[PDB]
Amino acid sequence: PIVQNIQGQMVHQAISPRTLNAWVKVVEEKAFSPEVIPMFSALSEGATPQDLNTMLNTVGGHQAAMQMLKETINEEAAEWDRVHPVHAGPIAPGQMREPRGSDIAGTTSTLQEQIGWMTNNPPIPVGEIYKRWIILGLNKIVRMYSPTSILDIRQGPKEPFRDYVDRFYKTLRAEQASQEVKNWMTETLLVQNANPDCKTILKALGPAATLEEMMTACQG
Amino acid sequence: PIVQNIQGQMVHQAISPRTLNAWVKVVEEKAFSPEVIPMFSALSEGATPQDLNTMLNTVGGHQAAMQMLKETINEEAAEWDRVHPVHAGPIAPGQMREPRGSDIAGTTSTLQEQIGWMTNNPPIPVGEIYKRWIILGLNKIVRMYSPTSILDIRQGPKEPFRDYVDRFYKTLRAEQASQEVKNWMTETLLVQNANPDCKTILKALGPAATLEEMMTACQG
Amino acid sequence: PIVQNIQGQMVHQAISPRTLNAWVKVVEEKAFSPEVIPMFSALSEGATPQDLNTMLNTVGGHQAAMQMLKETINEEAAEWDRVHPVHAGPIAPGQMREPRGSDIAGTTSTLQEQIGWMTNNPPIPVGEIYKRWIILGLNKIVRMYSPTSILDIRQGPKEPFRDYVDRFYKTLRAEQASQEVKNWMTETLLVQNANPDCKTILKALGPAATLEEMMTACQG
Amino acid sequence: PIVQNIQGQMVHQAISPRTLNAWVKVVEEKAFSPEVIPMFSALSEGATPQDLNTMLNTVGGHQAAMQMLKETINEEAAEWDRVHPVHAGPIAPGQMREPRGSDIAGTTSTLQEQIGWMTNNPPIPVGEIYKRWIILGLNKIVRMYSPTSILDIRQGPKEPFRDYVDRFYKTLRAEQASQEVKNWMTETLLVQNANPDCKTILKALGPAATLEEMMTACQG
Amino acid sequence: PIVQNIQGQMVHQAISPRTLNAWVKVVEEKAFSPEVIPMFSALSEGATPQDLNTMLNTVGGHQAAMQMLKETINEEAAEWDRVHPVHAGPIAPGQMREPRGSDIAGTTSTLQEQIGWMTNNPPIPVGEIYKRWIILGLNKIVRMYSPTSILDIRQGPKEPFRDYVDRFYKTLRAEQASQEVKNWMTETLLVQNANPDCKTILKALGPAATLEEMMTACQG
Amino acid sequence: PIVQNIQGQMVHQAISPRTLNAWVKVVEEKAFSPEVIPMFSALSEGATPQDLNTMLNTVGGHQAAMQMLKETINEEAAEWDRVHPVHAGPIAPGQMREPRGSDIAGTTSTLQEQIGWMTNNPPIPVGEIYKRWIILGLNKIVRMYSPTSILDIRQGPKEPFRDYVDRFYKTLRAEQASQEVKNWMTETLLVQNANPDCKTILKALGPAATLEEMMTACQG
Secondary structure, three states: OEOOOOOOOOOEOOOOHHHHHHHHHHHHHOOOOOOHHHHHHHHOOOOOHHHHHHHHHOOOOOHHHHHHHHHHHHHHHHHHHHHOOOOOOOOOOOOOOOOOOOOOOOOOOOHHHHHHHHOOOOOOOHHHHHHHHHHHHHHHHHHHOOOOOOOOOOOOOOOOHHHHHHHHHHHHHOOOOOHHHHHHHOOOHHHHOOOHHHHHHHHHHOOOOOHHHHHHHHOO | OEOOOOOOOOOEOOOOHHHHHHHHHHHHHOOOOOOHHHHHHHHOOOOOHHHHHHHHHHOOOOHHHHHHHHHHHHHHHHHHHHHOOOOOOOOOOOOOOOOOHHHHHOOOOOHHHHHHHHOOOOOOOHHHHHHHHHHHHHHHHHHHOOOOOOOOOOOOOOOOHHHHHHHHHHHHHHOOOOHHHHHHHHHHHHOOOOOHHHHHHHHHHOOOOOHHHHHHHOOO | OEEEOOOOOEEEOOOOHHHHHHHHHHHHHOOOOOOHHHHHHHHOOOOOHHHHHHHHHOOOOOHHHHHHHHHHHHHHHHHHHHHOOOOOOOOOOOOOOOOOHHHHHOOOOOHHHHHHHHOOOOOOOHHHHHHHHHHHHHHHHHHHOOOOOOOOOOOOOOOOHHHHHHHHHHHHHHOOOOOOOHHHHHHHHHHHOOOHHHHHHHHHHOOOOOHHHHHHHHHO | OEEEOOOOOEEEOOOOHHHHHHHHHHHHHOOOOOOHHHHHHHHOOOOOHHHHHHHHHOOOOOHHHHHHHHHHHHHHHHHHHHHOOOOOOOOOOOOOOOOOHHHHHOOOOOHHHHHHHHOOOOOOOHHHHHHHHHHHHHHHHHHHOOOOOHHHOOOOOOOOHHHHHHHHHHHHOOOOOOHHHHHHHHHHHHHHOOOHHHHHHHHHHOOOOOHHHHHHHHHO | OEOOOOOOOOOEOOOOHHHHHHHHHHHHHOOOOOOHHHHHHHHOOOOOHHHHHHHHHOOOOOHHHHHHHHHHHHHHHHHHHHHOOOOOOOOOOOOOOOOOHHHHHOOOOOHHHHHHHHOOOOOOOHHHHHHHHHHHHHHHHHHHOOOOOOOOOOOOOOOOHHHHHHHHHHHHHHOOOOHHHHHHHHHHHHOOOOOHHHHHHHHHHOOOOOOHHHHHHOOO | OEOOOOOOOOOEOOOOHHHHHHHHHHHHHOOOOOOHHHHHHHHOOOOOHHHHHHHHHOOOOOHHHHHHHHHHHHHHHHHHHHHOOOOOOOOOOOOOOOOOOOOOOOOOOOHHHHHHHHOOOOOOOHHHHHHHHHHHHHHHHHHHOOOOOHHHOOOOOOOOHHHHHHHHHHHHHOOOOOHHHHHHHOOOHHHHOOOHHHHHHHHOOOOOOOHHHHHHHHOO
């Protein structure tokens, strides 16, 4: 990737095998979860788009999500070339060409062009935009891979409350809902779809119950 | 994490993959125990708020504990903002603004802001404050995750005394309380739930004696 | 491979033992997956023909595939020698001789000659051409290694649509086709060889629908 | 710990997570062996007292040994405070204050104070004294862990001499005795509790013989 | 191994412990395979004769093969000394003496001698000659360790054709012979010991046909 | 240990935990073999005597060999202080004291004295002499650990020849015999203690048989 030396001038570095090996291993073990996105954002930090493309191509299995993220990249590139037209025809000497929809991903562009683009003054955050697009794609993927809806979460007659609320927060974290509606529903749907005795206990305790109080009361 | 080193201190390195991978593995194998608190304190010695956010987001499972930790951090940030109000009006040029209650959690701040706040003269230990917040959250988590109470610890007819006192001290360390009452409770509970042989041995020895003599008395 | 020292001259670094061991182990683990070609492409970034030959010869097993790729290498070298003439005479300083097919293959070349050919101005991409030939041979072998045909794979009565589309994309990646017509298969046959219920669902929704919405409709 | 950069000034480098991981793994697999104390001595080469505190706190289980070593640390700190008076007043530049037992332990001190104390002229070996106290506590713990006394081991009728002398030395490495008397012990108890036939063999050969010839004679 | 790099080339580094451990593991698990010669050629790329001796001394088991390798190396060194006699009389000042037959094996030489021999102008590649000796010895070892002869390889009624030709080519690579007979023996031995159906298929295809068509003919 | 920087000036470095863990694993898996002496010589190359002392003290089990190597170290130190008398009473300014029998091992000498001795001009190879003494001690240990004498090896009526000659060469390499007598007995004891039929077959070939002939003829 990209490393910073104590001198001040940075150079290009090839992709290390350890990072891609760890990525493949965590994809195999952790098939799909909300945690795969922060780990991907922290592992591919400061990397060329070719490195991210190779990481997305070396993963074995789950080709549906790969096609989904590829279509998302294509749509984002189309929107980019639609909203950013090429008004300047000629190119000034010493300046490189502007990254287009197919060049921002690295399909028809070599590594030297990406190096010259990211090392410009001022730099062009092509890698950052590509990482943001991949993060949006992974968000869409983990939203699609939700086992069930948040409304369909109902505690059974004998199922404990710990695993119930765990699955509730798990299926709520992967939902694409905003923070406001999530904070609004986490105070109502948690108590309305609980064990009847524990539900009545929590309702009689008061309308200002917190997490620890509910955990201590619902288990008694 | 931020690195203070020889000339060229203006550098920022992301979290190493090995560290976060080992953290995920140990929080997976060791789901929740008071051992994880010194581990987190050592793995995040002088780390950035974004690094701590990534470390808290990389752990998979146990969403209830994460929600409790988040709400404790929010409550403590609100308390800090209440006790440390922000000054109104224009800020002085060249003087960095004091970190707000929400800026400590890193939810509405950027990397350059915390970099300038940590490398200021004098430095502002916001990272240490957030680490203390996470430590308090983990304390509350390991206190609410206790399956058996400290009082219910009673040594059986065949359970060894060493394993009994080890379990007792582990349960005592799992709970957080003032040491001034801990000194009394350990003495009023250790010599009461032992085997009859060890009980009469410690009665013949003396209550005000040390612990090593009690360990070497009823051994074997 | 070839690396650049910090503020130094271009020097040649030896083969990576850890990378070679990782490759020889990942071969055994994933004996033949479609990702082995991107894996080799990422592990052989800027590698020398001698290192590539050693990495090919160090693999245990798959001797039939090794013989096939060697035959393809010989055919490519013969085609290169036929399309590019060979000249002889005195070797002037600063200019290298005309590389022959056996010189491109690296069987009758040496390390110093390879370094002189790859570090010339302009550089002769002998290693790049050899890597392209190797990945083309691997593509041929993985196309021959296709168990189920793209035109022979059909969704069963009890086979889930997720596994169906996964195997469909795997067979599409494993078969041979051009980039332009590649979309025609995944656009037509994917809906023409599916279950009748989801066929009617997609026909009622619209053929222009994307994979995400068509799968969310076929699941419901 | 403390390291010296090449042609640089003495700077304090952060702790290594792999060191703590190896430490916790070796204390988990090898719960309490005689060699774990040289292991700790080699892992804590030139480390700050905070590093040793974190390393001791990161250990999972065996809280009785932790309480015992904490009591020994408190006793050593009290003895140091009693033997070394404490003075107060203005702190002159270039000279540090009188370290107190609570400061030697590192429980009520910070990092910058320890750094200034260890990098002063002349250096105050606070970390060395703390490491000596910790290894003395570990010696006490490993002596308490010894199940069999030095005088309680005797060679059986069917037990070979190799395993006998191995267990004898393993028990001697965990007893409480000085080297001067340890020499006499390993000289006389080895022949006093041996096999009668090999006893007569060694008496005919001579007590001043080395262990090699004694073992070769007892085997034959 | 020798390190040819930027200014400061006068340096000799011992074999890395990780590479030696990997070699020990690949020798212990895979005692002898036709792919161990490329493994040795890659792990010992540009190494001093002392490093090669240390690698050959750390082998576990198979002492007869090591004795065969040693006697073959001695015979080849004697042949080299016979074909390259050493000049008598005083040596010229400043000119390094030519390596003798026994000096190549490193049995009567030191480290400084071989360092000066490999770093002379022009360099004397004695390490490459010793590596050739070692790989010839390994070829003799793997040819002697052949459990079943090449002629006795016959495909059963149920064994697949791909695995059959893989085993055939593996056994052919394990044996070292001239190139002008192998291409004839493979053609005169493969199309005779196949399945009756595959035999009729290849008889319907043609003897002078390629191998890929034979592989894709009787597949499945 | 001791590392060489690119600048030219070397500094002291603490013992890495990875090498110590590797040594412990080698000792645990392979208790004692004639091949571990080269492993120790290549792993502890250029290390301070304190590092070797810690490595010899961190080993778990087989304390007989540890006592043997300690006695050999003591005997070598006694011989050193006997053959090297201290004829110079006073010490010149700027010169360090001469290493005595107890100082050459590091019992009553700190690490700073060893660093000053090894970095002197000219350097005093204390570490090299200590490594040679440890190598001699390990040689004595592996000689004592020999299973039986070379004469006791006799091939049974049904025991194969491969394992027979393997054990023969193993106990020959583990034997303290010189190079001449080993080559003298390897031509006689191998043919005189074999299977009678294969013995007569090998004797009918002649007195100029090689190892490959002995292997290929005795198996027929």
